[PDB]
Amino acid sequence: PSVFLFPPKPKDTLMISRTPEVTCVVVDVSHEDPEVKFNWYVDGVEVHNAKTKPREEQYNSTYRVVSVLTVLHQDWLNGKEYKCKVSNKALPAPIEKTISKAKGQPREPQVYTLPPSRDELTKNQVSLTCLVKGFYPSDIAVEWESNGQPENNYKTTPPVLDSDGSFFLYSKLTVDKSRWQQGNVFSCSVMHEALHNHYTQKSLSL
Amino acid sequence: PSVFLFPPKPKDTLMISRTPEVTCVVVDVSHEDPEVKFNWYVDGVEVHNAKTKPREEQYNSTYRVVSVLTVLHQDWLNGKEYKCKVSNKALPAPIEKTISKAKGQPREPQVYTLPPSRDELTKNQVSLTCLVKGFYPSDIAVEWESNGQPENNYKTTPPVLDSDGSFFLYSKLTVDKSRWQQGNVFSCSVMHEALHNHYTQKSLSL
Ligand SMILES: *[C@@H]1O[C@H](CO[C@@H]2O[C@@H](C)[C@@H](O)[C@@H](O)[C@@H]2O)[C@@H](O[C@@H]2O[C@H](CO)[C@@H](O[C@@H]3O[C@H](CO[C@H]4O[C@H](CO)[C@@H](O)[C@H](O)[C@@H]4O[C@@H]4O[C@H](CO)[C@@H](O[C@@H]5O[C@H](CO)[C@H](O)[C@H](O)[C@H]5O)[C@H](O)[C@H]4NC(C)=O)[C@@H](O)[C@H](O[C@H]4O[C@H](CO)[C@@H](O)[C@H](O)[C@@H]4O)[C@@H]3O)[C@H](O)[C@H]2NC(C)=O)[C@H](O)[C@H]1NC(C)=O
Ligand SMILES: *[C@@H]1O[C@H](CO[C@@H]2O[C@@H](C)[C@@H](O)[C@@H](O)[C@@H]2O)[C@@H](O[C@@H]2O[C@H](CO)[C@@H](O[C@@H]3O[C@H](CO[C@H]4O[C@H](CO)[C@@H](O)[C@H](O)[C@@H]4O[C@@H]4O[C@H](CO)[C@@H](O[C@@H]5O[C@H](CO)[C@H](O)[C@H](O)[C@H]5O)[C@H](O)[C@H]4NC(C)=O)[C@@H](O)[C@H](O[C@H]4O[C@H](CO)[C@@H](O)[C@H](O)[C@@H]4O)[C@@H]3O)[C@H](O)[C@H]2NC(C)=O)[C@H](O)[C@H]1NC(C)=O
Ligand SMILES: [Zn+2]
Ligand SMILES: [Zn+2]
Ligand SMILES: [Zn+2]
Ligand SMILES: [Zn+2]
Ligand SMILES: [Zn+2]
Ligand SMILES: [Zn+2]
């Protein structure tokens, strides 16, 4: 009987319109003692609005049971701590797990767009680069757009720990050299808790 | 009794002056049966030049024993396969492990240097960017230099799998804006099997 507690999707925590939730998973629940109760606490205060899912038997003759607690946008960003306690007759004592947003003084990213290198304008496609640096904590989302439509031919590196303790990354959008030279506007779009409204946008053009 | 087989350091495989080696580690060797023999094979042909280290007792009442086989620069790059076989009276059968250089058609990186973004020239330090794209396999080394001396105030992202099946990364070197504007030459230095002599260099200046 082991317990895992998973945080919300990072994007769900950064957009007020979404519903972040924390997920408490119990595995290796017995057939002989399959009863399980969850208790949830927010900063140690018990709360009662979680949603537990019906048990599901696994192929290795164990049960798996899940409970989902919605968290408030502001509670998560303000560092509230979420505890999941799992009780079962087979355990000597209940199992407790706690989770919160990544801790530490927040730092606002600086977003910089970089045009193709001169040497790359030989090729048929060119790389449009978005540098995002100086942010803390590392939870971040990055996407690209042009003319009110997503540009999805991109890849983004994981966050990399920089020498001052902040994080940076780069996102690379690949476009036809014709579109670059035709003058279209491309935008690097960044979501991070420390931005105003957790959002900023930076453009790139010839 | 478990066996782990480790490849050479990537940089040791890319510089003919260095000595790449493969390392075969055996852990959880008994006290009651601590005798261990290694056999090594290169493409299935037994070889006899390995160097086995004396057993070392661990704090959990087990032994750990290591054998080191040197590999030739060309053998490793040409995809030869190295097998480590570990025999012990406590096993029903010997344990065999095989390792080789990462497999797949090699692809030569393109190296591009990118100067600071216009918006960053406000700050006291600026970011010099080296994009390395299109390479396969992902083993790679990246460093920076200026005026025949290393510039070590840099960070490099891990390789990221690109949508064509090749890899890319970015390396970010941070320098005083004064040095950038004084006109110094900075060089992104890249080692990868698919380059000529597994080496190339690209420069960056105002
Ligand atoms: C008997 O079987 C059960 C059932 O599982 C088997 O499952 C697979 C393999 C099948 O093929 C069959 O063989 C079986 O049915 C076994 O249960 C497993 O026990 C493992 C421990 O022994 C446990 O390992 C731990 O996994 C953690 C990762 O879990 C992730 O990722 C795995 C895949 O990598 C995935 O299977 C899980 O479902 C889970 O996926 C995430 O789930 C969360 C919660 O739902 C998601 O979060 C939500 O996402 C939504 C959107 O999707 C939304 O954003 C919500 O807001 C958000 O909350 C999240 O998105 C999911 N991610 C993905 C990518 O899907 C590890 O973290 C953990 O690691 C710790 O382990 C070590 C410490 O001991 C350390 O290395 C380290 O510290 C790690 O932190 C464990 O590895 C398995 O997860 C668990 N399987 C399941 C399905 O629960 C059981 O073990 C077996 N018993 C025996 C005796 O064999
Ligand atoms: C009893 O104790 C022993 C001894 O260890 C204890 O060790 C530590 C923890 C102490 O604090 C004490 O508690 C004990 O003394 C236990 O032995 C351990 O068993 C583990 C398995 O149960 C095994 O795990 C496997 O580790 C692999 C990684 O090994 C790396 O990294 C670890 C740290 O992460 C490091 O400790 C190892 O030494 C090894 O380090 C690399 O070694 C290679 C070879 O030397 C280096 O390569 C060479 O490098 C040089 C330059 O340095 C040169 O370039 C050469 O050319 C090159 O060949 C390499 O540089 C080293 N790297 C670093 C960063 O140092 C994992 O890969 C492996 O993973 C597989 O595991 C799973 C599959 O089952 C999967 O997740 C996955 O597929 C993984 O691939 C395992 O996790 C430990 O390594 C092993 N410890 C040692 C020291 O050998 C024993 O278990 C314990 N028994 C019991 C019952 O408790
Ligand atoms: Zn309740
Ligand atoms: Zn706490
Ligand atoms: Zn908010
Ligand atoms: Zn021999
Ligand atoms: Zn083979
Ligand atoms: Zn060579």
UniProtKB/Swiss-Prot annotation, chains A, B:
According to the record, mutating N197A results in: Impaired ability to activate the classical complement pathway
The record's subcellular location field reads: Secreted; Cell membrane
Q: What is the effect of changing Y63R?
A: Impaired ability to activate the classical complement pathway
Segments carrying the region annotation (Constant (C) domain) are 1-206
What residues does the Ig-like domain cover? Answer: 1-100, 109-205
Describe what happens upon changing H198R. Answer: Enhanced ability to activate the classical complement pathway
Q: Which pairs are disulfide-linked?
A: C24-C84, C130-C188
Glycosylation positions? N60
Upon changing A90K, the result is: Impaired ability to activate the classical complement pathway
Instruction: Give the record's subunit note.
Output: Immunoglobulins are composed of two identical heavy chains and two identical light chains; disulfide-linked.
Its function, per the record, reads: Immunoglobulins, also known as antibodies, are membrane-bound or secreted glycoproteins produced by B lymphocytes. In the recognition phase of humoral immunity, the membrane-bound immunoglobulins serve as receptors which, upon binding of a specific antigen, trigger the clonal expansion and differentiation of B lymphocytes into immunoglobulins-secreting plasma cells. Secreted immunoglobulins mediate the effector phase of humoral immunity, which results in the elimination of bound antigens.
Q: What is this protein called?
A: Immunoglobulin gamma-1 heavy chain
Q: Which organism is it from?
A: Homo sapiens
Included stretch of the parent chain? 240 to 445 of 449
